[PDB]
Amino acid sequence: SVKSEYAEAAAVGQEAVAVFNTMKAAFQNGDKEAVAQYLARLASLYTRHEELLNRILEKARREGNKEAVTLMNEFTATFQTGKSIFNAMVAAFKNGDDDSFESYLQALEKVTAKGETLADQIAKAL
Ligand SMILES: NS(=O)(=O)c1ccccc1F
Numbered sequence: 211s212v213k214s215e216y217a218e219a220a221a222v223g224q225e226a227v228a229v230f231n232t233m234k235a236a237f238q239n240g241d242k243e244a245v246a247q248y249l250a251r252l253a254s255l256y257t258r259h260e261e262l263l264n265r266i267l268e269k270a271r272r273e274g275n276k277e278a279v280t281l282m283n284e285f286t287a288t289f290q291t292g293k294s295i296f297n298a299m300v301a302a303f304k305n306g307d308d309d310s311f312e313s314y315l316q317a318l319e320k321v322t323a324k325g326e327t328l329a330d331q332i333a334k335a336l
Contacts, residue, residue: 212269212278213336219262220329226255227322234315242303249300256293263289270336278335285332288325292318 233248263286270278295318302310 211336212266212273213333215262215269216266216333216336219259219266220333222255222259222262223329226252226259229255230318237308237311237315245303249303252296253300256296260289260293266336275336278332281328281332281335285325285328288321288328292321292325295321 229248229251233245233252236244236248263282267279267282267286270282295314299311299314299318302308302314
């Protein structure tokens, strides 16, 4: 069901949370080789999550589930904010700009924490 597809998407999201926190520890410790690998892993995870969320939204649309569509439109918009900040973080790593990297890292945490009440709302709506 669309609900079980959302649970699969939620787990992929939690995997990115786990890798992100590991990455943050590596950055603080100066282990740039580790950071590079974690950023690659995160890119692949976010790409997967993005695709799953799109399939969930498209299915809710085909089902006529208006409330779930509303919530998923809001959630996918916030996802794109996180993606843009993530991409900027990757660029800051490439460029050696640790000040920008720290900034983007905190921003991405706050955007992610904010979007969590909506994430739980969607589960209940599908
Ligand atoms: N989980 S999020 O903040 O919407 C997000 C989406 C895509 C990339 C990085 C991110 F942080």
